[PDB]
Amino acid sequence: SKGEELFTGVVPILVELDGDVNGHKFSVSGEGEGDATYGKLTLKFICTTGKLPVPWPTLVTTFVQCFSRYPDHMKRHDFFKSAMPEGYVQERTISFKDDGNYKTRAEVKFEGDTLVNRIELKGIDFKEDGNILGHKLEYNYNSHNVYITADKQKNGIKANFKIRHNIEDGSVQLADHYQQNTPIGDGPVLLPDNHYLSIQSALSKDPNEKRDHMVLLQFVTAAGITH
Ligand SMILES: [Mg+2]
Ligand SMILES: [Mg+2]
C-alpha cells in the first residue's frame, strides 16, 4: 500500500515537543532516523529551554509507532503506516501512580521525506517532591508490551499499557498509559485485529553533549498473531 512503501528504507525523524508540567514550561527538539524493516529507531533529544523539569525517561513514550516492524503476515494490521503520509493524531493520558498525569496530543506525519512527531504536553497534579518533579527516576528504561485494539468509530486504534520507571531507591513508578490514534488524512487506513507491539529501549548520554539531552535506541516488533 501507499503508506507501507514510505518505510521500506531509512527515514529521517524530527520530534518537537512543547510542555507545561505544573507550570514549568519547556521545549524539546529531537532528531534521528527509523528503519521499520528492522523495527529500529535512533533518536537524540535536546531540551532547548534549559534543564528538563521532569525526568527524561518519563517522556520516552511521548517522543513514532509507524517504525514498528510488522511481520509480513501482519501487514494488514499496521494502522500506523496506513495513515501515512497524511499522518495521525496520537493522544494519551499518562497517569503516574500516586502522582500527577500527562495529557499529550501529537501529530505524526511526513513533511516531505521526513517523519515528524509534533507534541503538546500538559502535566498537572504532580507532587513537588514526588518521583517526577523530584527527579528520583533512574536513567534507564524497561521493555514493555503495548496491546493495540481497533477504535472503529474514530477510524483508528487505541491502546492501554503500563510503563514502569525505576526509582533510585530500587522501587518502581508506574505510569499507566491510555492511547487513542485517529488518522488525519482521507486515505484508507487499516483497522487491526488485537495484537501487541514488543518494545525495548536503551537510554544513553552523548559524552560530548553539555545540553540536557537523551539518546534513545529502540526496537519495536509487532506480535501476538501467529502466521
Ligand atoms: Mg531547532
Ligand atoms: Mg531497580
Author numbering: 2 to 64, 68 to 231
Which sentences did the original study use to describe this structure?
GFP has a β-barrel fold, and the chromophore is formed at the center from the three amino acid residues Ser65, Tyr66 and Gly675,6.
Isoleucine is very similar to valine in structure and properties, and it has been reported that the A state is selectively stabilized both in the T203V and T203I variants. The yield of purified sample of the T203I/E222Q variant was 4 mg per liter of culture, one-fifth less than that of the T203V/E222Q variant. The peak wavelengths of the UV–Vis absorption spectrum at pH 7.4 are almost identical to those of the T203V/E222Q variant, indicating that the I state is also stabilized in the T203I/E222Q variant. The crystal structure of the T203I/E222Q variant was determined at 1.48 Å resolution. The distance between Nδ1 of His148 and Oη of the chromophore is 2.85 Å. Ile203 take a conformation similar to Val203 in the T203V/E222Q variant, and the interaction manner with the chromophore is also similar with the T203V/E222Q variant. For the distance between Nδ1 of His148 and Oη of the chromophore, average-strength hydrogen bonds were observed in the T203V/E222Q and T203I/E222Q variants. On a plot for the two structural parameters, the three states appear in different regions.
